[PDB]
Ligand binder design. Sequence first.
Ligand SMILES: c1ccc2c(c1)ccn2C1CCNCC1
Ligand SMILES: c1ccc2c(c1)ccn2C1CCNCC1
Lengths: 196, 196
Amino acid sequence: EEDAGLVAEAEAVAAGWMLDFLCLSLCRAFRDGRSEDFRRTRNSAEAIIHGLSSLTACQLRTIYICQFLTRIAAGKTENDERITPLESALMIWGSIEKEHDKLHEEIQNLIKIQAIAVCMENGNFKEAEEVFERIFGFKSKLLMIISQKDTFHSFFQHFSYNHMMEKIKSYVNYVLSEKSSTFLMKAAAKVVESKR
Amino acid sequence: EEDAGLVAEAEAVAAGWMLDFLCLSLCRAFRDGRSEDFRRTRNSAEAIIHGLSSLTACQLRTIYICQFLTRIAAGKTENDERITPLESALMIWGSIEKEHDKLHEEIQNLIKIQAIAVCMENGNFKEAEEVFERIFGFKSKLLMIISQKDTFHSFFQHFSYNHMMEKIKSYVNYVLSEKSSTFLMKAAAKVVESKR
Ligand SMILES: c1ccc2c(c1)ccn2C1CCNCC1
Ligand SMILES: c1ccc2c(c1)ccn2C1CCNCC1
């Protein structure tokens, strides 16, 4: 009395629910700075995403948000990539199916500058120069900064790591708001409120 | 307006639901012989299980069933273990909180003999002897069989790999029956039936 095609469909429905639940959990961990919870949720999201072979426009946006937050999280720290985590986040950011509003351009430019600045902070100025060449192939001034190891120039005061994280966290808050109504989290919260 | 403790509770409720759903999916993949689906479901189960730090008596049984099926699946094929997959399945089997009925003892003895026989099938008779020593430290007859490379002796006709898989699959059917009513799969099926 069991139809394998209907069971495969029930598993894909459940995977879709688990995906949204894990994106919400990844968003809250990123917002709260819970590193180990972020790492655990990312692993679960990546594993659940393998149980899906066809994704809708909304599901593709969800996996790309998880991929984006994963690269941002590894920003100051392969596997098939010859670019830096922040350069990889920049490629995900520019190809998400989303409006290129002021907030999008703010995040994009903050990531572009921080991709260079995190290399300078870590003491690898040859890498900072290689990152600048891949992103920017202000250019003359920015190149002089890398060359002189001017890590604390006032340009990096406005285009700081903290500012990049603040703008990304505001975007994360919109994603948290949009996904708060998803099936899995909503049902889980009702169980918690009933206890209680 | 957000309580982190209540959100952590909602995530643990959802993890409990995802655990049961993935155990059911692991059970059907094992029963249907869907190897790649089994590998994918096992990875997701192992990742979701990390999002839990305190497990109930029922949840511990669920993770040990997943661990057991994983070792059985790798039977004919480390990571912190100096024993063979089937020897490791034998340790999980003997410590699950479950009645040691005729079916339990049938599965236990079939695994004990197959742990030796899979080494003989793979042509490693020194390993078959090392496995026999770890499990059996019939003994005199079984040791003569390994020594003479008597892989096709009639003892292995009754205690065959196919018989081991058949008895394990019957146990899997009981687990599938017991977990069919779990929240995640039940809700997923209702969506499929509504479409149809
Ligand atoms: C969350 C985080 C990363 C994720 C997913 C979901 C899905 C895929 N990935 C990457 C993609 C880049 N390489 C490593 C695996
Ligand atoms: C499904 C399958 C294996 C699983 C789990 C769930 C949870 C833990 N493990 C093992 C335990 C042995 N070492 C490798 C990880």
